[PDB]
Enzyme design. Sequence first.
Site, PDB file in Angstrom:
ATOM      1  NE  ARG A  17      -1.924  -1.679   3.425  1.00 20.67           N
ATOM      2  CZ  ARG A  17      -2.324  -1.916   4.664  1.00 20.67           C
ATOM      3  NH1 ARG A  17      -3.572  -1.695   5.048  1.00 20.67           N
ATOM      4  NH2 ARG A  17      -1.449  -2.386   5.545  1.00 20.67           N
ATOM      5  CG  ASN A  35      -3.796  -4.954   3.002  1.00 22.24           C
ATOM      6  OD1 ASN A  35      -3.322  -4.666   1.916  1.00 22.24           O
ATOM      7  ND2 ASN A  35      -3.030  -5.259   4.040  1.00 22.24           N
TER       8      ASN A  35
HETATM    9 NA    NA Z   1      -5.508  -2.711   4.618  1.00 18.90          NA
HETATM   10 NA    NA Z   2       2.024  -0.689   3.044  1.00 16.90          NA
END
Ligand code: NA
Ligand code: NA
EC number: 3.6.1.7
Length: 87
Positions: A17, A35
């Site tokens: 991310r 996620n």
């Molecule tokens: Na996440």
């Molecule tokens: Na990350």
Amino acid sequence: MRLTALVSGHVQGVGYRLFVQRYARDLGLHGYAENLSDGKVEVIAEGDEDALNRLLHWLRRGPPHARVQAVDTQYSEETGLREFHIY
Ligand code: NA
Ligand code: NA
């Protein structure tokens, strides 16, 4: 436009991310990376069509130690999201 990308593989727990956020900011894109509980990462990115393609290049590689097996893409209209966040 808005890219909604679903990323499969060894992708959680490896800084994916943060990696997406860095490149989205480099490319002038807004949206988020999150996620999913099924093991995937979802990336929403809004901006110019070519910048979305450049982001996809990075999505298919990931950071060191990620093993990205696939990126499913779907496109829709921009909603005006600001900033690029991780959830
Ligand atoms: Na996440
Ligand atoms: Na990350």
